[PDB]
Design a protein around this ligand. Sequence first.
Ligand SMILES: Cc1cc2nc3c(=O)[nH]c(=O)nc-3n(C[C@H](O)[C@H](O)[C@H](O)COP(=O)(O)O)c2cc1C
Ligand code: SF4
Ligand code: SF4
Ligand code: SF4
Ligand code: FES
Ligand code: FES
Lengths: 262, 117, 431, 35, 214
Amino acid sequence: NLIEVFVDGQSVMVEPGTTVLQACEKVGMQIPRFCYHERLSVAGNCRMCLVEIEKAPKVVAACAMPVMKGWNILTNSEKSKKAREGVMEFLLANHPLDCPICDQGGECDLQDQSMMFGSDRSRFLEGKRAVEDKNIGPLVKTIMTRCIQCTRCIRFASEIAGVDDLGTTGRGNDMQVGTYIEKMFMSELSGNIIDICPVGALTSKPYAFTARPWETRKTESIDVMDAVGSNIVVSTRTGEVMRILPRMHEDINEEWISDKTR
Amino acid sequence: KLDITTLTGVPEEHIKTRKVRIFVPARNNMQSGVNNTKKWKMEFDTRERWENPLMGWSSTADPLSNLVLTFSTKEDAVAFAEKNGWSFDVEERKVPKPKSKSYGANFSWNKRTRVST
Amino acid sequence: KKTSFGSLKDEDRIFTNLYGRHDWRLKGAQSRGDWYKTKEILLKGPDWILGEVKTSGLRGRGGAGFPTGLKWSFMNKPSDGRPKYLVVNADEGEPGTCKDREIIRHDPHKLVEGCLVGGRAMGARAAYIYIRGEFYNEASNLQVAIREAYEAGLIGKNACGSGYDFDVFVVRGAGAYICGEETALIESIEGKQGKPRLKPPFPADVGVFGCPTTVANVETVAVSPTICRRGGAWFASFGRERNSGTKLFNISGHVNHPCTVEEEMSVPLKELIEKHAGGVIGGWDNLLAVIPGGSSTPLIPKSVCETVLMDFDALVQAQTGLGTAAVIVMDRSTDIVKAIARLIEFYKHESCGQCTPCREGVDWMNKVMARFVKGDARPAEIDSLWEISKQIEGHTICALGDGAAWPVQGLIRHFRPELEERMQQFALQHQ
Amino acid sequence: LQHHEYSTYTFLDLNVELSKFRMPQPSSGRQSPRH
Amino acid sequence: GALFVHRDTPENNPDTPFDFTPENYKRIEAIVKNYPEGHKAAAVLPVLDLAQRQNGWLPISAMNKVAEILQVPPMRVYEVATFYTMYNRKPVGKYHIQVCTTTPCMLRNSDSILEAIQKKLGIKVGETTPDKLFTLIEVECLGACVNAPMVQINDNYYEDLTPKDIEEIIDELKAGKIPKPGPRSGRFSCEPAGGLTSLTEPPKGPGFGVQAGL
Ligand SMILES: Cc1cc2nc3c(=O)[nH]c(=O)nc-3n(C[C@H](O)[C@H](O)[C@H](O)COP(=O)(O)O)c2cc1C
Ligand code: SF4
Ligand code: SF4
Ligand code: SF4
Ligand code: FES
Ligand code: FES
């Protein structure tokens, strides 16, 4: 029972229950996101998915709003752009100036979305917050000061990994992600939180400081550690293998690889 | 049956002994953006890279090591490869399958989709 | 048809035992008219109860003020096999608000009979009354009243002999203002962090334990039995159109006699302050920036306070809100900037943090306001703060963000000259 | 005036007393969502 | 200023002995009976309150015990403990003095009461007396804004306070005498100080103004 909705005036037929963001994907528009991962559950905390629906006073989160018949999604209206700029400013208000030394630098969703949907200057005239780093294991190098509380790691650990050890402690601006205790996040799919993290809060310890994204040459290959046959991308620079990244194959491995493969 | 191989000036070894890969680049899993996955790409096979004795810089003898081409459709890339006489391998485009997302499911009364946090 | 409201006789006062002088136990409530012919009301049917509420024109007393009848009728749909629940919001977290505390402490059986009536209207098996954890003694009193009602058979199996099975559970909070939010309240009852959900899945369809659940403020539930017994037109008689009913008012701050009083809606603010609260300290001339309906509602300067009427739509025209109907009064011997900054600090300490606008912007506003009270800022920071508040408002998934933005907007709009004067004085001091 | 004298376990003890009057609870059909 | 990460200490190690008393176990069973079957995780907050009441503060072992009893992941219990202010994750004094310093209470010179408490106890806010009988903490609106000033102790509201009143209450607690909660001024409740401007007449009684068609 496909219903008709409009994205910037273009008719697109979507099944009922489709999120606004998914219809925008149907017409090709990629709504900016920070907390929404299609594999994971919807959370609606990034607030970057706030888009304006025609004749609706209040903007809605595309990731969490099911479409209604006859809705016109204005993805580039002034309200949508202003909401995106405000959310980006709030995200970058406390974020540390770690881009040159952050391993995520060059492949950071925060950086790119700031360059594309955010302001080019900062009005923040106060001190930034700092968070003590947590140790979650020998694989994931953690700098929580860079975290944006997107909650991707938590939801991933709960749903895909199945290990309910990562959670949010505190309230308000002092809210911190991570084990309240000195527990170590151990799982086969533990390394995938590095990939899932938009910011360089969670990064690969063996890969740390080794190379920058633009240098690397990407070669698409298949892993041999297991008989699953996960598709991987072998990132090589100057003839040396630098890291192994998952490659999407919905039938075999959705977007994940084992720790041994990684 | 178009053949520009004689006219290109490429030496025969790279015309015959090189396998060119036609594909749509997969999304860099580190990022959620998908804009870099909308155009077909033609990439040549990787060859030997060795360290320069003096400085340790990676040296190559493959002229087409860095050559990459962008094509709107698979057929255009195939036609270009055929006209240039390069053996080609085509990897079919991988699209994310549609997913059913419900924020309500996070608070199911009886289903297992309920989220602990 | 009356053009001037503001005088309510003791006969029409719903909360007869508001001050607690009469007995709060079951005997006192029954003597005062509570639990009277409740069986007939339940047997009349859900539709008649909902229609009585709709005719009453009751607006939600939590602060949002949605039409109570339609809000409850949302639950009237036939059951899908899942249970239905009614949650009475007793968080009482809005600063300046003390009405629900009096209701639970001194007239608990009113709330219990209201829960029974509403659950019958909503077709709910049980009701959970979420009480602020700091309200331990009031929670114990409510538990005692629930026990008495169970002993009398008013609640439980065959409640009031109506063949309807209803239970009231009291759940105590753990000290979070945000739990006052209906979705946050639902999550807190479910045992998770009290972080409000997203609206698209409405509480009517999915609520506590993933079941149909309606959240109503203590006053809204408590007035339901009296609205049913006396009649919807009786409630409609008091107050203006769309603002019908008698609303508890909490007058605090720089008033000679701080008190909580019940009066008809649309009562003039001056009349309420002078008649019941003993007048402003130093007289009405000393009045400055009354908070109309609690911290969330923006302040109104004295000039508006002279002629404003305390009802939803009228105060909305005053760029403010009725809110929780809590009136906070400041004399001219008050640093309005300091009061508003303290309120924003309250909001900072009470934010969940899940929504990025709230999590970062609220702290940003608190720091900016602290610099303002110090005077250590440039004039354009006023406009910068206004734009920050506008960004926070309407984007936050919860309404605490708007609740925080609104005080800042009101303070700017009505007292920018004081801010600029303090900045200039600071600059002169430091040279 | 009764509220002046309440102990730490007063609320919980009142809940224990009320347990008997409580009606049967509804069941999701599973021991836990994790089950 | 309290941290939201747990550093294991000899007093607060996971091996710190804590277990519910059998009476508290029965109370827990009654609590679990309240919520529907299959959602026993809803009991986390009341059971944590019970543990804090039993022990006076919540050690990590207590949180783990709550998690075990309710069969929920321990991280959920940690999140609940950290999120809600009432839970004490550190040992606190015998009497916990909580002063409401929000704007309504502030207008009624709550800072005077706070300073009086500091001088009498000798401890600054957020500190515990060396005798470990008094811990002073400022809090937000406690719900008694009309009767400001108001300070809370372990479970009781001492509202409508003056510096002499708070000093007297502290002296009574030090002596072991239990002060009566409520307004320490003349008023008994939210009632107007001068006199009742409402509800002066006796209650109307049952059957008053009842709609005929019911
Ligand atoms: C941040 C926040 C705090 C709230 N606190 C309370 C509260 O303490 N008590 C209350 O009754 N409603 C509170 N509310 C309003 C509730 O979310 C909800 O609207 C109310 O319980 C509905 O009552 P009503 O049906 O009478 O309108 C709060 C809302 C927000 C956004
Ligand atoms: S994670 Fe933060 S510090 Fe690192 S590159 Fe991205 S924006 Fe810069
Ligand atoms: S650590 Fe990374 S993945 Fe986890 S909440 Fe923070 S930003 Fe998101
Ligand atoms: S607006 Fe603030 S308090 Fe409300 S849900 Fe969002 S983060 Fe929490
Ligand atoms: S990620 Fe879409 S609303 Fe936050
Ligand atoms: S302002 Fe003091 S109790 Fe709320």
